[PDB]
Amino acid sequence: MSGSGRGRGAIDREQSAAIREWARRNGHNVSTRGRIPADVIDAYHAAT
Template identity: 50%
Template sequence: MAQKVQVLLVDDLDGSEAEETVSFGLDGSSYEIDLSSSNAKRLREELAPFIEAARKVPAKRGAAKGKAKGKQRTVLSRERSAQIRAWAQQQGKPISERGRIPKSIVDEYEAAHR
């Protein structure tokens, strides 16, 4: 039996369907948030006066750049997480909709799909 798992991005503010992931930085920390088109537009509009008055600086080199890059999730990793969550739910395993997937569940999923 074939299975098709679809990943649905959810707006982190209001729970509606998200169309994009927006990355931004503040006080030396990098952030990423999934937003609907309207909330992404609202965020950009709210930040616009500050961005217009700010100086753009080059990306940091070295450890800081590597550290921020390590936190970014690719679409592929999101799809894999969604597949693991869907599989765990089908198996009756307790798993949250968000957050880190327990290693034991990842290990079981990988063993079942070898």
């Protein structure tokens, strides 16, 4: 129950999942749109 691992960063997992987690870590509400907003995706690839 303590730690799920994840030694690797970058896009090791699904892009959508990665962007959603990034969104959540930054406080972007990606859930209600049922899709990831391109704006968040752009910001994602710009920050990360």
